[PDB]
Amino acid sequence: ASGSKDFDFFYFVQQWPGSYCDTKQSCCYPTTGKPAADFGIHGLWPNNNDGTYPSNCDPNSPYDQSQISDLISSMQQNWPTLACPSGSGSTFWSHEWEKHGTCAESVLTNQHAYFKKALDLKNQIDLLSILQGADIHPDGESYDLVNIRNAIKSAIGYTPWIQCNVDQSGNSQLYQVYICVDGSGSSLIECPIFPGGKCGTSIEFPTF
Q1: Annotation-wise, does 92 bind a ligand?
Q2: Is 42 a catalytic site residue?
Q3: What distance in Å separates the CA atoms of residue 116 and residue 72, rounded to the nearest whole number?
Q4: Where do the domains of the chain lie, and which CATH numbers do they carry?
Q5: Which of 8, 126, 133, 196 ranks highest by number of CB atoms within 10 Å?
Q6: What is the torsional sign of CA 90, 27, 137, 142?
């Protein structure tokens, strides 16, 4: 990012809950119930074109849920936390704003605009539907990494980045999908750079 531009673009990252709840650690359900079996938002992260990113940028603007009271039921459905201990979600959302949303205050000027941007992005990138449409289902099969990639790329027109983790038995599985968004927050772009990590050739899609 040069000049007075704070950062170069965003990753918009969604997570599959079945690969959060099959690992060596316990996941917990939030207090509104087991979530729907769908990708959820992990976060919308400002990032730069050298692989670095801004973080914790404004400690004088702590998260304030009364500013996003109109979004909360959408946030309950589409951005649930599965970390322990069971909670309403506010811990997770507080954490995303403080670490990451505070660094996008140049473009997305207040909390409400930040959270509403991530919910509008989820609503146009339906990953499940896209995958299902290519016959790729969370049914515990292993699928070739190239097919999942090409299915998303054919549907949205930009290449996603797939991050894997490993389940309790050590098997490499579909964890999170990152799509990139321009520095304005207005449109999908090809990522300028991709994060590190390894998936290997064939990966599970766990049931949830």
Answers
A1: yes
A2: yes
A3: 10
A4: 1-208 (3.90.730.10)
A5: 8
A6: positive
188-195 contacts, C-beta under 8 A, 24 or more apart: 188/156, 188/157, 188/158, 189/9, 189/158, 190/158, 190/159, 191/9, 191/11, 191/158, 191/159, 191/161, 192/8, 192/9, 192/49, 193/47, 193/49, 193/50, 193/51, 194/161, 195/11, 195/51, 195/161, 195/163
Cα 204 from Cα 148, distance rounded (Å): 11
DSSP characters over 124-142: H--HHHHHHHTT--SSS-E
**157: burial class by Cβ within 10 Å (0-12, 13-18, 19+)?**
exposed
| From 42, 141, 190, 204, active-site residue | 42
Catalytic: 100? Answer: yes
From 96, 98, 105, 112, active-site residue: 96
Structure's resolution in angstroms: 1.6
Experimental approach was X-ray
Among the listed residues 188, 169, 201, 175, the one whose alpha carbon sits nearest the alpha carbon of residue 117: 188
Measured between alpha carbons, how far is 82 from 87 in angstroms, rounded to an integer?
9
Q: Is 204 a catalytic residue?
A: no
